[PDB]
Amino acid sequence: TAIGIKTKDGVVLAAERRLSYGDFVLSKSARKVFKLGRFGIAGAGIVGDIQTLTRIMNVEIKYYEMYNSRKISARAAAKLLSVILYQNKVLPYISELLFGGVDEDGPKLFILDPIGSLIEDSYAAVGSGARVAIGVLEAEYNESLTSEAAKELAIKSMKSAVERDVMSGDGIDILIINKNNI
Amino acid sequence: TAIGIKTKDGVVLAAERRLSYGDFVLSKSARKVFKLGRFGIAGAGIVGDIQTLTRIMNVEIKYYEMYNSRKISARAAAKLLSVILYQNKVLPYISELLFGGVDEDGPKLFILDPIGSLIEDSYAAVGSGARVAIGVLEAEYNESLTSEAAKELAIKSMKSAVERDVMSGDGIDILIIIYEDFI
Amino acid sequence: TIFSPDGSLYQVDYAFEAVKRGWTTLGVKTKSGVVLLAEKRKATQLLDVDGIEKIFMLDDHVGCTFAGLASDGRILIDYARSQALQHRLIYDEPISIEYLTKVISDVKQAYTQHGGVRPFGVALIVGGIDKGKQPKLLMTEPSGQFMPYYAVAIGQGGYTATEYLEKNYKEDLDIQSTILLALRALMLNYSSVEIGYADVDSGTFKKLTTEERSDLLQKI
Amino acid sequence: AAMGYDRAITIFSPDGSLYQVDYAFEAVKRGWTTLGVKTKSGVVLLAEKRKATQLLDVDGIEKIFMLDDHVGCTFAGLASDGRILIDYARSQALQHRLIYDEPISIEYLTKVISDVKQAYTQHGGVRPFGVALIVGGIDKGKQPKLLMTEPSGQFMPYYAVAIGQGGYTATEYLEKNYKEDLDIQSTILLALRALMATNYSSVEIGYADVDSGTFKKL
Amino acid sequence: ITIFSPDGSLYQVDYAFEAVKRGWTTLGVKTKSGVVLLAEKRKATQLLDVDGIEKIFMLDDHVGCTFAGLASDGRILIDYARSQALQHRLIYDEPISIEYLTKVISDVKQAYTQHGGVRPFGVALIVGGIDKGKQPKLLMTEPSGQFMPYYAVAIGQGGYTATEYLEKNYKEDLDIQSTILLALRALMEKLNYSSVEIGYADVDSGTFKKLTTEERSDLLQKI
Amino acid sequence: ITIFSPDGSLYQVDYAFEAVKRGWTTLGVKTKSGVVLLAEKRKATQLLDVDGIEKIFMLDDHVGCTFAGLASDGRILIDYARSQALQHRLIYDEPISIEYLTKVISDVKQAYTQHGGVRPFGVALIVGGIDKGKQPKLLMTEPSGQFMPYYAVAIGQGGYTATEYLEKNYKEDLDIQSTILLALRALMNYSSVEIGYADVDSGTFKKLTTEERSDLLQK
Amino acid sequence: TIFSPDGSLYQVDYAFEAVKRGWTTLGVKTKSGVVLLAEKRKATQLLDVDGIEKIFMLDDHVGCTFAGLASDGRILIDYARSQALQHRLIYDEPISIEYLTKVISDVKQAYTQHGGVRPFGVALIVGGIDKGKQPKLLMTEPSGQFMPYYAVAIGQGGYTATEYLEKNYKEDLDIQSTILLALRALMYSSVEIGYADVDSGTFKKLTTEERSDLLQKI
Amino acid sequence: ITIFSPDGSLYQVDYAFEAVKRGWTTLGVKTKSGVVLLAEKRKATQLLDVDGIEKIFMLDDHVGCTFAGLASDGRILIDYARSQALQHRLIYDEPISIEYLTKVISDVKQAYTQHGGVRPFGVALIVGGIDKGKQPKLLMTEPSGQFMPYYAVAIGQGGYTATEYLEKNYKEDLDIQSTILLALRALMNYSSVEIGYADVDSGTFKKLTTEERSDLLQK
Amino acid sequence: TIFSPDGSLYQVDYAFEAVKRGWTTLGVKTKSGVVLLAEKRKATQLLDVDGIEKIFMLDDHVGCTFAGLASDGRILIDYARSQALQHRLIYDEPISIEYLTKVISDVKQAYTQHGGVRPFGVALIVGGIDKGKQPKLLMTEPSGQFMPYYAVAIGQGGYTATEYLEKNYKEDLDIQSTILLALRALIGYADVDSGTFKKLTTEERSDLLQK
C-alpha cells in the first residue's frame, strides 16, 4: 500500500510500514518510502527489489548530477527508471512504484510497473489495499487542495486500507514535497 | 482499443486512455496515442512495450532523417517497425499496433502484430473492444469520407466499445493526419 | 599509421600514387543522367578481356567502377553489396548513395588508422540514380574522403580526361550525348571498354552489351 | 627539444610533448578554414568550400553536420577521421535522448568525443585523429556553449575561433572587432568578414538561435 | 619505453613527470579543520571562455580533486574515479575512503606503466575530501603510481615557488577564511576575479562545493 | 611486407611472383571442345616416385586446377577451395561457378597481402571449369589477388617459352585430342607429366589414364 | 626477455639496482618472534610522513614491507591479500607463508618471461608466525627467487645493516631485544615498526607512543 | 622470418633445412615387399641410457616414422600426427591413408612458415606405413611443407653418403631381410642403431627387439 | 626465435649457459635405487641454508631437482605437479615418467618457438620408481630434448662430477652405496622395494659427513 496525491502546491506520498510473508508478519517497521534528494519514491511488492531500486536510482541520480551541470528533472528520472525496469524484463523487478517530484514545469506524479510502463496521474495507490485506498481518493479528490489537507486525505485513505486489508497495517510515514522543504 | 480510419484526405487514429490490470483500474489517464514526426502511431496491450516502441521508433526516424538527407516514408517506417518487432521473436513485444501516415503515394494505414506482420487496410481496430468497434465501422463506412466525418465515426465506434467492453472507456484521444482534439 | 611533421600521411599518398598507375576509369553526371565507363587495356593477346570485369552493379539502381589494384577494390565491392542489400532487407527501400559511400569510406578510414593493416590502394567512383530528386555520383579516396563530382576520371590518363571534361562540359545534355562525351574523354577497339549507364526515366542501372556499346562507340 | 622520438605515438619526448599529436595538429592546419562565433544572441559557425577542380560539387559537398536538432558542428583537417567521430557523436546523443528523453548538455557530448580522442592517443597500434572539431549548440537553459576538440583530447571553450589554412588571419581579425552586445544578423556578418580577410555561393553557413532552440543551415 | 635503465629508473615516468611540470599551477592545502584546493586558469587567447572551462572536478559529494599536466589523460582518469566511487556507494551505501579511491586510480596508473603498447599517463592528481568524520585527508597521485599524502602541496609551472611559500608560513590552526587565504597567497598578469577556480570542503557540513562567481570576487578582493 | 613503395608497387608481391617463376612449368588451355591443363614433373633424384607425386588436383568433378611455385602454400589454398566448393554444393545442390571459386581463393590471397604478421602466398593457380551448360572458362590467380581469364597460358621456369609457342599456333576451334596435342607441344621427354582434361559433352574432369597418355604423347 | 651470452637477464639485474636505490627496510627473526620495520625518510617539510605507509598487514598473522618502487609492490600487495583471503575462505585456515611467497614470486616470474611486460622493480620481505615452527621469514627477488633469511635489510644502507647484523646476530634474544637489534641495525618518529609474537599468534604494528618510548630507551 | 628474398626463396626455411642437415642420420627404405626405417643413435657421453632413448615413434598400428634435426619440434609434431590419426580412426573406424597424415603434418609446417611471430619447424620427417593395398609406402616432410614420396632416402650428417650408397645397386623387390640388410649397409655396434620394419603379410609393424638386432649383426 | 646460418638457436645455448652457472645438482640411477641431491651454497651468513628448498616432490613416487634459475623451473614444477595429479585423477594410476617429462619438455618447446616469450633457463633431472620394471631417470634441456641417463650432474662443478661418475660407476649398488657415490661426486632417494620417494630428515645428513 502506497498513496500519492498531486496538489497545486506539491506532491504528497504516504505508505505502510508492514511486511508479512505468507500469513505471518515478520516486521512491524519496514520502510517503504524513500527520499532521493528533492525527489521521493514509494512502492509495494518485494522489499529487496524496492530497496535496490532506491539505491541504484540514488547512484545514477548522482551520476547525472555530477556530469551535466543541471539538476535532474522528474520526467528524466522516470524514463531512466522505466528503462532500468525494462532491461530486466526476463527477470522483472517485482515491484509497482510511485515516483513523485516537483520540476519547473510543475508538480509531477508517476506510476511505474515491473515491466516499466510510465503513467502520469494526479492521484494513485499501489499494492494490496490500493483498491480500497483509491476508493477513498475517488470520493474526495479535488484539483484545488492544500498540502496539509492532502496529508489528512492520505491518512484517511491509508487508515481505511489498514482496517480492510490483511497485508497492510499500522505504521504510516508521510513525505510532503513542496519546493522549499523536503 | 484503438481505431484507424483511412480517408481520401488523410488518416484518423483514435484510442482509449484507460489502463486496468486484472479487474482493477490503476489509471484513468494513460496515453495510448502518440505523435512521432509527420505521422502518428497508436496501439493496445502492455503500456511499457508501446512506450518503448514509440521511443525506439522516434530515435530511428531521426536516424534515417539525418543520415539520408531526406524525410521518411510510411512503408519504410512500417517495414522497419516490422523488423524491430521480428528480431525479438523469442521475447515478443506484447503489443498490437496501428501505424498511420500520409506519403506522396497517398494515405497509408498499417496493422502490426507482436511477431511483426505488416498489413495495409482502410479501417481497423486493435485490442479488447476491437470486435465491438469494428462492428460499428463495418456498418457505416464508405471509401468516400471526409476527415471530420471520420472523426465522428471514430467517436461513435469507440463509444460503442466503451459501453460494451470492460477494458476501455473514459476519454479517447484522436490524431487526424496534424491536428489533435480531445472530445 | 605515423604522422609526418607537416601532418600528411605518407602511406595514403603512396596509395593514391598506386591508383594513378591504374587503368583509366570515367564517371560523368549531368542533368540527363549517369554514365560511367572504364578502359580495358590488353597486355597479352590471349587474355579473355571480353570476360574480365571492371563495372560492378551494387544494386539495380547503382553501379560503380574502381581503379588502382584489383583485389582491394573487389573485397570493398563485396562489402558495398552486403551493406546495400542489408539496408534493403531492413527498410525494403533503395539505399541513399551518401550512406553506401559513407560506410565504404569509413572502412577505408578504419584501415588507415590501425597498425598492422595496409591501407586500400583503390579509388572508387560510385554513381546511382534511385533518388527521386536528381542523380548522384561520388568518389572515394584512400584517405577516406568524399568528393562529389559532376564528372571525373582517374588512372594513368586521368589528368588528360580531366582537362578535356573541363573544356566541353554541358550540364544539360542528352544521355546519348553524355555517353558520347565520356567516349571522347577516353580518346580503342571493339573489345577495349566497358560502359554502363543509369537513366532517370526508368530508375535502373545496366552495363552495355557487346553489339550495343559497339554500335554507339563507332559514332565517336 | 629532441626529435628522435617520433616513432609510433605511444612515446614521450624528453621535453614531455607527444610529437605525433602536434603533427596531427599540423594536419588540421592544412585543412580548410572553418569558423565558429558565439556572442549572446546565438550561434554562427561556417566553413570555407574551396573548389580544387571545376568539376566539383561545391554546393553538393557537406562539411556542416547536424549532431542533433539543437547542436551542429564542423571539422577541419582530414575528412574521414572527423566523420567517423561524427558518427560516434550522433550515436551518443541519440542514446542520451533515448534514456532521459532530454536534450544533451554540450559538455557531455564534447566529453565523450574527446575521451575517444584520448583513447586513440594512448594505445599502441592506433593512429591518432588528425581532425579538430568546433561544436555549437543552444539547447541548454543558459545561453550558447562553444567548444573545440584538439587531437590531444583537450577542451577549449571559445567565444569565437577559426582553424585551418587561414585560421590565424581570421583569428587576428576576430581579435580586432569582436564584442558581446551584438545580434544574429551582425554575428553572421562578422564570420563572413573573418573569412574574407583570408565568393559566389561557396561557403556553408549554419546558425543556432536562442529564441527557438534549434539549429539550421543555409 | 617500458624498459629499465641500468641505474633502475624508468625514464618515461620521469619524462611524464616533466610533462606535469609543464602544466598549469594547481594547489591543495590540508589543515586541521577542512580542505581547500584551487587551480590557476591562465588565458592564452582573448577569445577563451575562461570562466566556463573546468579544472576542479567533483568525484563524490565529499571528494573533489584537480589535475595538472595533460587534460585528456587526467580526465578519462576522472571518469574511472567517479565510476569506482559510485560503484562503492551502490554496494555499501556508504561514502568512500580516499585511500581506496586513490588506490584504484594509482593502480590504473601502474598498469599503464608496465605494459608494452600503452603510453603512461602524463597527469598528476591532487585529491581532497572529508571522508567520514575524523579530520580531512589529502593525497597526490604521481604517474609512477605512488601515493604521497601531504599537508599542503602545489604542482605546475610555479609549483616549486608555491611549495616554498607554503614551506614558509604553514599555520597549524585552520580557519574558514584563513585556509582559503593561504592558498590565495601561495599562487604567486595581475590576478583576475573571474579567472581562477576554487573549491573547498569543510568539516562541519561534510560536503564539497566549488565557489560561485560572486564568491570568487568577494574573496579575491581582500588580498 | 605491408608497406607501399613510392611508385606504388608492393615489392613482396613481386618477390612472390618471382617465386612462382622459379616453379615447375604448368599449362592450361581452353577451347570450344573443352579444357586441358597439365604440369611438368621433373625428376631431381632417382629416388623420386614420379608416379606418386601429385600436382593436378580435382576441386569438384567439373573443376580441376594446378599450382606452381611452392607446394604447401597452394596446397592449403587447395583445401580452402575444396571446402568452399562443397559448401556451395551443400547449400544450393548445384555445381559452382568458377568466378566465385576463384573469387574466394583470390580474396584469401588479398587478405594475406594486407595484414602485418602474415607472409603472402607464393603460389599461382590455373583453374579449368566447364560450369553448367556453358563453354569452359579458365582463370589464373596471381599472389596479388588479381584475376586474369585466359584462353591459354603457362607459368614456371619455361613459362615464357610455352607462352610464345601458344602465341604462335593457338586458335579457338579444335578437338580435345588436338588441344592436348597442343599443350604437349608447348611443354617443348618420354613420360614425366600429369595431364587432366575436361570435355563439354560429358561435363566432367578426369585424370591420368597412362594408356591415352602414351598414345597421345607419340603424336 | 632476451638472454645475454653469459646467461644473465640484464633487465632483472637492473630492477635489483632499483631496489638498491630504495629506502632501507629491515626484517629480523629470533626465537622470541617476528620484527620487521622500515625507514621513513622525509624529502619535504610538507610531506605527511605521519600518514605514509610502508608496513602492510596481509593477514592477522602475516605482515610484510617492500623496497624499491611503491606501485609495483603495492599492486603486488593486493594480489597477496587476495590470495590469502581466498585460501582462508577455502580451508578456513591460516595460510602457509611458503605458499603466499610462492604465488607472489610466480607472478614475478610471469612478468620476467613475457615480451611486452616490464618486470617488477620491488623486493619484498615477509614475516609471520604461520603454524608453530618458530619464526618464518622470506625475501622476494624480482627474478622470482626465494631466499629465507634469519635477518636481512635491503635499500640504500642495506649492506651496512647486513654487515651489522652479521656482527651481532644472536639466538637468545628477547622480543624486546630483537626490536632493539633492528633499531641498532638502522643506525624520533620517522620509522614505523611492526612485530609478530609467538605467544599470541598475531601481527601488531607499533603505535606512536610505543615506538617513541622504545626509541628513547636505546 | 616471413619475408621474400628478391630471388623468391625464404631464407629461414633453408636455414631450418640446414638444421636437419646437422641432425643424426636417419634412414628409410621402401621396396615392393615392405618397409624398413631405422635411425642412428650416437653416444656423446658415456652415461646415456642409449638402450632407452627413442627416435622411432609409432603413429598408428600401421603407420610410423622417424625424425631428424631438432628433437622437440618433431616431437610435438609427432603428438599432432598421432592425434590426427586417432581422430580419423574414431570417425571412420578405418586405418588412415598416409597422404592424409603427411598432408596435415605438412600443412601445420606451412602454417608456421607463413605467420609472423612463429619460428618454423627445424625437423624433417620420413613416414612409412602400409594402409591397405599400397604396401610399399614412404613419404618425407620438408620444413617448407613439401611432399616428396621416395623409394629410399636418408638425411642427417651422413645423409648424402647413404643417399649415394642407396643410389648405387638396388632393385625393386627383395625379401625384408635383404632390405633391412640394405639399410644397415647404407649406415656403414649392436645397439648404436635402432630399427623398425613393416611387413606386407601381416599389415602391422612390430619393432625389432634387440635380440633380433644381435642376430642381424653377425652373419 | 630466429635461426643462425648453421641452424642453431643461439638463445637456447645462452639459456644452457645460464644452467651452467647454476648450483651443482646430482642424479644417479642404479638397478636397485634412485638417489638425487643438490648443493646448497651459503652466500650470506644470515641465509638459513637448512630452510631453502631445491628438491621437490612431484608425486608420491617422483621427485626432481632443477639447476639454473629458480623461478623458471619452479613455475614448471607447478605445471608438473598439476599434470601428474590430473593423470592420477583420471586413471587412478601412477604416472609414467616419459609422459611427465614429455609434457614438461613440450612446454619448454612452446616457449622456444613463439616470438614475445623468453625460453626457460632451467634444466631438470627427474627420478621416479613407480614403474613395474626398475628406476627411470631423465633430464630436460631448455631446447626441449630428452636424454635418459644412468647418472648425470649439471651446474658449476657439473663437468667434474660428470667425469667422476665416468670413473667409478656400477650397475648393482645398495641404496647406501649409490648415495655414497653421489656424495663423493660432490638429499632425496627413491627405493624400489617400497615404491615411494622418501626425503631424509635433518638428523640423517649428520650420518653422512661422519660415515
CB pairs under 8 A between F and H: 91
Q: Give the dihedral sign, CA A121/A123/A127/A128.
A: negative
Q: Which residue in H117, H180, H107 sits closest to H145, CA to CA?
A: H107
Q: Is G200 helix (H, G, I), strand (E, B) or coil?
A: coil
Nearest to G152 among I19, I46, I78 (CB): I46
The answer for B 82-121 residues in CB contact with A (under 8 A) is 91
* Residue pointed to by grid coordinates 595533460: E70
For residue E61, the enclosing domain spans 11-220
The technique by which this structure was obtained is X-ray
Coil, strand, or helix at residue E216?
Answer: helix
Residue C4 counted as domain residue: no
G199 in a structural domain: yes
Q: Could you tell me if E156 and E26 are in contact, meaning their C-beta atoms sit under 8 angstroms apart? A: yes
Look up residue F213 and give its three cell numbers: 597418355
A106 CB-contact burial (10 Å; exposed 0-12 / middle 13-18 / buried 19+): exposed
Residues 52-91 of B with CB under 8 A from C: 64, 67-70, 73, 75-76, 79-80, 83
Check I149 against H49: CB less than 8 A apart: yes
* Consecutive H or E run containing I62: strand I62-68
**CATH number of the structural domain spanning residue I150:** 3.60.20.10
CB proximity I171 to H under 8 Å:
no
**8 Å CB contact of B68 and C99:** yes
Which of G45, G74, G117 is closest, CB to CB, to E167? G45
Could you tell me how far CA F120 lies from the centroid of its own chain?
18
Q: What are the C-alpha distances in Å from A32 to residues A42, A44, A131, C201, D118?
A: 6, 7, 18, 69, 45
Which of C18, G197, H77 lies closest to C10, judged by CA? C18
Contacting partners of chain C (3+ CB pairs under 8 A)? B, D, F
Q: Helix/strand/coil (H, E, C) string of chain A? A: CEEEEECCCCEEEEECCCEEECCEEEECCCCCEEEECCEEEEEEECHHHHHHHHHHHHHHHHHHHHHCCCCCCHHHHHHHHHHHHHHCCCCCCCEEEEEEEEECCEEEEEEECCCCCEEECCEEEECCCHHHHHHHHHHHCCCCCCHHHHHHHHHHHHHHHHHHCCCCCCCCEEEEECCCCC
Map grid coordinates 638402450 to a residue.
Answer: H51
Helix axes E98-111, G71-91, angle to 10 degrees: 110
Under DSSP, the state recorded for I188 is E
**How many other CB atoms are found less than 10 A from the CB of residue G21?**
15
Which cell numbers in the block locate residue H63?
603407420
Phi then psi for residue B5, to 5 deg, are -130, 125
Estimate the crossing angle of helix I71-91 against helix G97-110, to 10 degrees: 110
Closest CA to D184 of D158, D139, D215, D142: D215
Closest chain A residue to D102 measured between Cα atoms?
A76
In a domain? residue G176 = yes
Task: Give the list of residues 6+ apart from residue F139 with CB closer than 8 angstroms, or none.
Answer: F98, F99, F102, F126, F127, F129, F147, F148, F149, F150
Q: Single out the residue of D158, D38, D135 nearest to residue D85, CA to CA.
A: D135
Catalytic entry in B1, B7, B52, B54? B1
CA distance B144 to D109: 51
Name which of A9, A18, A4, A11 is nearest A125 in CA terms. Answer: A4
Which among A69, A70, A76 has the least Cβ separation from residue D101? Answer: A76
- CB pair distance less than 8 Å for E93 and A55: yes
CB E75 within 8 Å of CB E55: no
Q: Which of B27, B28, B53, B93 to mutate: most A Cβ within 10 Å? A: B27
Domains of chain B, start order: 2-180 (3.60.20.10)
Cα(G196)–Cα(G202) distance, integer angstroms: 6
Contact F167 C47 (CB under 8 A): no
Residues with Cβ within 8 Å of residue I209, at least 6 apart in sequence? none
Polymer length of chain G: 218
8 A C-beta contact, residue D146 and residue D91: no
Asked if G36 and G28 count as a contact pair (C-beta separation under 8 A), the reply is: yes
Cβ distance of E151 and G46 shorter than 8 Å: yes
Residues of A labelled as active-site residues: 1
Rounded distance between C-alpha atoms, residue I153 and residue I163, angstroms: 10
Which residue in E18, E117, E120 is closest to D15 by CB distance? Answer: E18
CB contact under 8 A, A119 and B47: yes
The radius of gyration computed from the CA coordinates of chain C, to the nearest angstrom, equals 17
Cβ contacts from C onto D, under 8 A: 107
Is C211 in the B-facing interface, judged by CB distances under 8 Å?
A: no
| Cα three-residue angle A23-A28-A30, rounded to 5 degrees | 100
Closest CA to F128 of F108, F151, F111: F151
Q: Lay out the sheet containing D214-217: strands in order across.
A: D160-163, D34-38, D42-48, D203-209, D214-217
Residue I6, min C-alpha distance to chain H (Å): 6
DSSP at I171: S
Q: Identify whether F4 is part of a domain.
A: no
Number of domains in chain I: 1
Query: What is the 3-state composition of chain I as percent helix, strand, coil, each rounded to the nearest 5?
Result: 35, 25, 40
Q: Helix, strand, coil % (nearest 5) of chain F? A: 35, 25, 40
Give the integer Cα–Cα distance in Å for D87 and D116. 12
C-alpha H84/C-alpha H107 separation (Å) is: 12
- Region for residue F4 given its phi and psi (left: phi exceeds 0; alpha: psi -120 to 50; beta: otherwise): beta
Please tell me the distance in Å from C29's CA to the nearest CA on chain B: 20
Residue pairs between chains E and G whose CB atoms are closer than 8 Å: 98
Three cell numbers, residue I105: 619438455
E2 to G111: CB separation less than 8 angstroms, yes or no: no
Do the Cβ atoms of E19 and D14 come within 8 Å?
no
Question: Does residue C3 fall inside a structural domain?
Answer: no
Chain F residues within 8 A of H4 when measuring between CB atoms: 12, 15-16, 18-19, 119-120, 122
Cβ-based neighbours of A121, under 8 Å, separated by 6 or more: A6, A109, A111, B27, B28, B29
Preceding residues of all breaks in chain C (C to N beyond 2.5 angstroms)? 187
Flag whether E179 is in a domain: yes
Residue D115 sits at the vertex; the CA angle it makes with D110 and D117, to the nearest 5 degrees, is 95
E-strand ranges in chain C read: 25-29, 33-39, 55-59, 62-68, 122-128, 138-140, 146-148, 151-154, 193-199, 204-207
E24 part of a folded domain: yes
Q: Pick from C11, C52, C71: which is nearest to F144 by CB? A: C71
8 Å CB contact of F109 and C71 = yes
G75 to chain E, any CB pair closer than 8 A? The answer is: yes
The Cβ of residue D196 has, within 10 Å, a number of other Cβ atoms equal to: 12
The answer to whether D185 contacts chain E (CB < 8 Å) is no
Among D66, D69, D94, beta carbon nearest to B59: D94
User: From CA C92, how far away is CA C84, in angstroms rounded?
Assistant: 11
H100 to chain F, any CB pair closer than 8 A? The answer is no
Q: Is I183 helix (H, G, I), strand (E, B) or coil?
A: helix
Chain F contact for C78 (CB, 8 A cutoff) = yes
Residue where the block lists cell 471526409: B146
- Residue E33: strand pairing partners: none
Decide if C1 is inside a domain.
no
Radius of gyration of chain F (CA): 17
Q: How many helices (H) and strands (E) does chain C have?
A: 6, 10
Residues near C92 by beta carbon (within 8 Å), at least 6 away in sequence: B75, B76, B79
For chain E, the chains sharing at least 3 beta-carbon pairs closer than 8 angstroms are: A, D, G
Residue I125 to residue I145: CA distance in whole angstroms: 12
C-alpha cell at H42: 650416437
Beta bridge partners of residue B109, listed in sequence order = B100
G and E interact (at least 3 Cβ pairs within 8 A): yes
Q: Does residue D3 sit at the A interface (CB-CB below 8 Å)? A: no
